[PDB]
Amino acid sequence: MNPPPPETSNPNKPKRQTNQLQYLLRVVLKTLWKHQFAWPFQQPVDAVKLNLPDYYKIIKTPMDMGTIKKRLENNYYWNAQECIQDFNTMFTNCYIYNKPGDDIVLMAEALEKLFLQKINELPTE
Numbered sequence: 001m002n003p004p005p006p007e008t009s010n011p012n013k014p015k016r017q018t019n020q021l022q023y024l025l026r027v028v029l030k031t032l033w034k035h036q037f038a039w040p041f042q043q044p045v046d047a048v049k050l051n052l053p054d055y056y057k058i059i060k061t062p063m064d065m066g067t068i069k070k071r072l073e074n075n076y077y078w079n080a081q082e083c084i085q086d087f088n089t090m091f092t093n094c095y096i097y098n099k100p101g102d103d104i105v106l107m108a109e110a111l112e113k114l115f116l117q118k119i120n121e122l123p124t125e
C-alpha cells in the first residue's frame with residue numbers, strides 16, 4: 001500500500017530562487033530526466049503498481065525526480081544543497097531497498113554518476 005507522496009509545497013517553509021537552483025532544474029534535472037535509465041525515478045514508487053508491497057516498510061524517506069522537479073518548479077527549496085540532498089536520498093533509497101548488482105541498482109548507479117558530473121561545477125551567485 002502507498003503512503004501519501006512527499007510534499008511539493010509547504011506554506012510554513014520559506015521559498016527561494018537562486019542561480020544554482022535554477023541550474024538544478026534547467027540542466028541537472030532536465031538532463032537526467034532524458035537518460036535511458038530515468039524512468040523508475042520519474043515518479044514516487046507506486047508499491048501496488050510495481051508489486052513492491054514492502055517498499056515503504058523499508059524506505060521511510062522516499063524521494064524521486066518527479067517530486068524534485070515539482071519542488072524546483074515551486075521554489076520549495078531554500079538552497080541547492082537541499083535539492084542535492086533530495087537527489088542523494090533518492091539514490092541511497094534505491095541502494096538500500098535493493099542489492100548490489102540488481103538491474104535497478106545499475107540504473108541508479110549510472111544516473112548518480114551523471115548527476116555527480118553535472119553538479120561538479122555549479123553557477124556562482
Ligand SMILES: CC(=O)c1c(C)[nH]c(-c2nc3cc(N)ccc3[nH]2)c1-c1ccccc1
Binds near residue numbers: 041059
Ligand atoms: C524488477 C524488480 O523486481 C525490482 C527490484 C528488485 N527493485 C526494484 C526497484 N527498487 C527500487 C528502489 C527505489 N528506491 C526506487 C525504484 C526502485 N525500483 C524493481 C522494479 C520494479 C518495477 C519497475 C522497475 C524496477
